[PDB]
Design a protein around this nucleic acid. Structure first.
Lengths: 49, 49, 102, 44, 73, 49, 305
DNA sequence: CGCATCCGTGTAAGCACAATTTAACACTTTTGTCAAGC
DNA sequence: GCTTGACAAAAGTGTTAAATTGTGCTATACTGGGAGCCACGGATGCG
């Protein structure tokens, strides 16, 4: 659950660096939110990892 | 990117929803990048033009 | 079942009345925060150190700056130049400029 | 001496104060030497 | 080795071997006479598990008499 | 955004919520809630409380 | 539904997939804008100036190239999903695979060549597959294995599957060594490196209450009887035998570092005083002979296993 | 203003090249050792 | 009791080869997942 948070947090930093269009950046931010939510309370929103 | 703590997002009831006067299923959409939201509106500009 | 912590544990008596001399060095980070690190009297103090805030800081004394010899990273311009030459793209730019005027 | 226990709300500054160093990589341990990898999880 | 252990080794005529002792021993409270032993060896084409070079099984037989605390019914 | 961008500021995701909290003030909500509680003839009394 | 996969699938359709005669202008504008930026950089470096019309045109084409790159990326986002959907079940999240394929797509757009006449769909597939494979190799295991070792493991697995299918029965380490031109011990090493860990959180004991980590001994625990006895050594071996020998043991304190912690060579303990190397060499043997005496030797027998 | 019903919730790389780390070899300095004598 | 000098073995410096790890490239066309074998309390519209 911790690695999930790190990996995505790194990938976002690349996507912002490469200046990708807002669709991919928004998707990355949403996955980061979901990963943090799963880290704290897995299964409180959506299906559990 | 900032991330919200899940406990306060949907704390049954949503503590953040009550604090920010955002109803359930509307604050949820904003968090998960499902809709836009206005953070501030400049009333000074519209008076001039 | 039994296992290991990928380490070792000993029982040597801990003491504090006889300790090595420490020459603390303070490093300042770009964000403005400062962190102190105790180093032994052997010196050999590095010019830059990775602080607790996750980013590298420089020694406050103001010495040993880097020359920035690191090789610049590749970019889109480099990937673009290899497949096509200068003249072919000067022609392209002229063509694009012509259309705008038209 | 213990007198009372308080449970406040943690902000970014509190987390950074507790932190001893930022985790930059998902590394846990070396696959061959089994030593913890630096700048990652389990970092010594 | 800690310096005291090295000094003690120097006092006597022993040196630290590179091996730990992990021999099998009778569990606490168990005793009796060894009545049988069976050995399987990877060197003898035995169906040992992966990574296991040898397997030894020892049977200990003990004769228990009736004593205080035993349950009858 | 492209017609009246300078008239307003919009965002989405946790960043918009963070901004709302920065520009939000707690006192006014408390005063309004107290006023509604002391004047809540209808159902709004329970929600305000 | 709260599924984030569905939200992405129903979002990438906002842009229609392009065709051969519609995408060429995109790369054309991208290159034109990039070289407009290069000409502006040269202008800044050489201190040149251009008519306001030319400057505005150059900036507008730079913006147009940026917009064309964004539009091409958005249009080809669908190919990324269509390619990454295949790698499900390996052990990596679907959306992370999609995003790594998006990185590969960005690289392909950066390295596309319309002049060769080929289609973008053919060229970008290789980059997307490479990005997905790199992502899987780098960050699909709790204990990261380098890329080359991951490739070796994949090759060994494929050969093992082929041999098992051909012969039906399970292969042998000798067979794998013969096929892969490596030693059987190397095959075992690769198998161990490919071994994945388990989680302590798994239930144990045929009941759902207990957990696997409940029954793991702490091999590094400080056994009390030893921990106390070692300190008693600091009372006996470290102290009393020294009181009855004066400097014959005082030098030994420096020899093994009982004070200040440093064991020291003969010169280091000798050079600071008026005693030579050979004399300390003799004194060490004399002390060893003295302490071998039964009266002193018998006391310390119990502190050595 | 109370009740019926709706909702939230606890199946598919491999190669090439560059860069870093680790070992093997060679020589040199240092350490411990021995005899003998001052 | 202590010192001097030759000698053998162990511990450093440095060069080199090798193993080990990280990054980039491959152009028919291929473009929107697939899994899947409940009861209780709090709230809102209706009478």
């Amino acid at each position: 659950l911790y690695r999930r948070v790190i990996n995505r947090n790194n990938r976002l930093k690349r996507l912002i660096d490469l200046g990708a269009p807002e669709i991919i950046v928004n998707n990355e931010k949403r996955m980061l939110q979901e990963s943090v939510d799963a880290l704290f309370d897995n299964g409180r929103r959506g299906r559990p990892v | 990117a900032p991330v919200t703590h899940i406990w306060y997002f949907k704390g049954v009831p949503s503590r953040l929803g009550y604090l920010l006067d955002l109803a359930p299923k509307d604050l949820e959409k904003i968090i998960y990048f499902a809709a836009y939201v206005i953070t501030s509106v400049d009333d000074e500009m519209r008076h001039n033009e | 079942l039994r296992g290991s912590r990928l380490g070792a544990v000993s029982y040597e008596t801990d003491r504090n009345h006889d300790l090595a001399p420490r020459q603390v060095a303070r490093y300042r980070t770009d964000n403005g925060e400062e962190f102190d690190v105790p180093f032994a009297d052997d010196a050999e103090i590095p010019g830059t150190w990775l602080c607790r805030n996750g980013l590298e800081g420089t020694l406050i004394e103001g010495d040993v700056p880097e020359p920035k010899k690191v090789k610049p990273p590749r970019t889109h311009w480099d990937m673009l130049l290899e497949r096509r030459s200068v003249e072919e793209l000067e022609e392209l730019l002229k063509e694009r400029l012509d259309l705008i005027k038209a | 001496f213990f007198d009372e226990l308080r449970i406040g709300l943690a902000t970014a500054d509190d987390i950074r104060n507790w932190s001893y160093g930022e985790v930059k990589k998902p590394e846990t341990i070396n696959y061959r030497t089994l030593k913890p990898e630096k700048d990652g999880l389990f970092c010594e | 080795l800690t310096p005291e252990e090295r000094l003690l080794r120097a006092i006597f005529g022993e040196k630290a071997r590179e091996v730990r002792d992990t021999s099998l021993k009778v569990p606490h409270g168990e005793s009796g006479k060894v009545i049988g032993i069976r050995v399987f060896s990877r060197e003898d084409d035995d169906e040992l598990p992966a990574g296991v070079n040898e397997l030894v099984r020892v049977y200990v037989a003990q004769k228990r008499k009736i004593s205080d605390g035993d349950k009858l019914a | 955004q492209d017609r009246y961008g300078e008239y307003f500021t919009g965002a989405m995701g946790a960043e918009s919520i963070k901004k709302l909290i920065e520009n939000f003030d707690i006192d006014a909500e408390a005063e309004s809630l107290r006023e509604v509680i002391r004047s809540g003839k209808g159902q709004k009394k329970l929600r305000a409380l | 539904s709260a599924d984030s996969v569905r939200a992405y699938l129903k979002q990438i359709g906002k842009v229609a997939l392009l065709n051969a005669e519609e995408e060429v202008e995109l790369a054309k504008r991208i290159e034109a804008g990039l070289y407009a930026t290069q000409k502006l950089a040269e202008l800044a470096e050489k201190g040149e100036k251009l008519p306001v019309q030319q400057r505005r045109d150059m900036q507008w084409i730079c913006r147009d190239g940026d917009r064309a790159k964004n539009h091409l990326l958005e249009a080809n986002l669908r190919l990324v999903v269509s390619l990454a959907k295949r790698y499900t079940g390996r052990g990596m999240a679907f959306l992370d695979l999609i995003q790594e394929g998006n990185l590969g797509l960005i690289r392909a757009v950066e390295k596309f060549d319309y002049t060769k006449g080929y289609k973008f769909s053919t060229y970008a597939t290789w980059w997307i597959r490479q990005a997905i494979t790199r992502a899987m190799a780098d960050q699909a295991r709790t204990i990261r294995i380098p890329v080359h070792m991951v490739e070796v493991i994949n090759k060994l697995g494929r050969i093992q599957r082929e041999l098992l299918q051909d012969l039906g029965r399970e292969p042998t380490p000798e067979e794998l060594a013969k096929e892969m031109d490596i030693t059987p011990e190397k095959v075992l090493e690769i198998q161990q490196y490919a071994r994945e860990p388990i989680s302590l959180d798994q239930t144990i004991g045929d009941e759902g209450d207990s957990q696997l980590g409940d029954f793991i001994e702490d091999s590094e625990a400080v056994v009390a009887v030893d921990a106390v006895s070692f300190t008693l050594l600091q009372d006996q071996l470290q102290s009393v035998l020294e009181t009855l020998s004066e400097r014959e043991a005082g030098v030994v304190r420096l020899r093994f570092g009982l004070t200040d912690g440093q064991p020291r060579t003969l010169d280091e303990i000798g050079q600071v005083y008026g005693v030579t190397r050979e004399r300390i060499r003799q004194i060490e043997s004399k002390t060893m002979s003295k302490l071998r005496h039964p009266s002193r030797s018998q006391v310390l027998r119990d502190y050595l296993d």
